[PDB]
Amino acid sequence: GLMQFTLPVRLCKEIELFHFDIGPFENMWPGIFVYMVHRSCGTSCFELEKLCRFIMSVKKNYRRVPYHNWKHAVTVAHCMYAILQNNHTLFTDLERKGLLIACLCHDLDHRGFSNSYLQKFDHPLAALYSTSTMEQHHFSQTVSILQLEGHNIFSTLSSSEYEQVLEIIRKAIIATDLALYFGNRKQLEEMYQTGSLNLNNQSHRDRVIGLMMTACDLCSVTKLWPVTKLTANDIYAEFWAEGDEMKKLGIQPIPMMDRDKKDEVPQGQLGFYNAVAIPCYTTLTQILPPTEPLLKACRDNLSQWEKVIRGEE
Ligand SMILES: O=C1CCN(c2cccc(F)n2)CC1
Numbered sequence: 001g002l003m004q005f006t007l008p009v010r011l012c013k014e015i016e017l018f019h020f021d022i023g024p025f026e027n028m029w030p031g032i033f034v035y036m037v038h039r040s041c042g043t044s045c046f047e048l049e050k051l052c053r054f055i056m057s058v059k060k061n062y063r064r065v066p067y068h069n070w071k072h073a074v075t076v077a078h079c080m081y082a083i084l085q086n087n088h089t090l091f092t093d094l095e096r097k098g099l100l101i102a103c104l105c106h107d108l109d110h111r112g113f114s115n116s117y118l119q120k121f122d123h124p125l126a127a128l129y130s131t132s133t134m135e136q137h138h139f140s141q142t143v144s145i146l147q148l149e150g151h152n153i154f155s156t157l158s159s160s161e162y163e164q165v166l167e168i169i170r171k172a173i174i175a176t177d178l179a180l181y182f183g184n185r186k187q188l189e190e191m192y193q194t195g196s197l198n199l200n201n202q203s204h205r206d207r208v209i210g211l212m213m214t215a216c217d218l219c220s221v222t223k224l225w226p227v228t229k230l231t232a233n234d235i236y237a238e239f240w241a242e243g244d245e246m247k248k249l250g251i252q253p254i255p256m257m258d259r260d261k262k263d264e265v266p267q268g269q270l271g272f273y274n275a276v277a278i279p280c281y282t283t284l285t286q287i288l289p290p291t292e293p294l295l296k297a298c299r300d301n302l303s304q305w306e307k308v309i310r311g312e313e
C-alpha cells in the first residue's frame, strides 16, 4: 500500500499540463498511467497487482498500427487525467475510476480502419454491430480483459457500483465514435445557452462525459505544434492505407484518405479544426472552465496550419 510511483522531476511537473507528451520510451507508459490513477483516484482505487496485469493485457491487445496504438491509448488517458485534476470536485469516485480505464481501453484491437471501411469491406464486425462498429468492439474487448482470471480491477466494488462503472465505461467508449459527437455537442450547446444544463441530471452528465471523451480522443490537436505536426503524419499514414484498401474494393476514397492528394491535407486540417476541434474544446470550456488551455492550444495549432497554407512553413 505504501508503494508510490514517482516520475523524474521534468515528468512529475509536465504530466500535470494538458499539452504533456508521454515520450518515446514505451516501457515508462504503464508507470505513467499508474501514477495518474494514483493521483486522480487514490493508491487504494485498484489492487496494484491486478491493475498491472490489466494494463499489460490491454497493451497486448493494441496492434502495431501507425496511430490507433498503445501510445494513443495512454495519450488519451493522460488528457482525461488533466481534465479530472483541473475539475477536482465535479466528478464522483466511480467516474474517476471508470474514465481513465475507459480512455486506456477506448481503441482496443483497432485495425487502423474506419467504421465506413468495415461496412464497405463487409467485415463480420459490421454484421455484429451496425453502428459505432469499432466502438462496440472496443467495449467488448474491455469486458473480455476484465473477465480474465486476476484482471478484475473492480472486484472490491459492490454489485451496483460494478454495474454503474461498466455503464460509465460503455457510454464513454461509444461516445468516441466521432459520428455521434456532432449531435452530442449541438445538444450540449443548446443546454448551456438556454441554461437548462444540470450536472445532477444523469442524461446531462452522460452528454458532458461524451464531450470529454471526444476532447481527450482528439487531444493530438492540443499539443505544442511539433508534436501536433508529427502526430498528423501517423494519423494520415492510417488514412492513406485505408484509401489504398478503398481503391482495392474499386471505390475512390475521400480526398483525406487518398495519398495522391497530400497537397489538400493543410486545407483538410483547417476544415477539421473549424468543423470539429474548435467547437469541441469551446463547448467543453463553457461547461468546464479550467479546460481552457485545450481550446487555446487548439487555436494555436489552427494558426500553424494557416501558416502551412500561406507557404510560411
Ligand atoms: O477530417 C479529419 C482530419 C484528420 N482527422 C484528425 C483526427 C484527430 C486529430 C487530427 F489531427 N486529425 C480525422 C478526420
Ligand SMILES: [Mg+2]
Pocket: 106, 107, 134, 176, 177
Ligand atoms: Mg476510436
Ligand SMILES: [Zn+2]
Pocket: 072, 076, 106, 107, 176, 217
Ligand atoms: Zn481514439
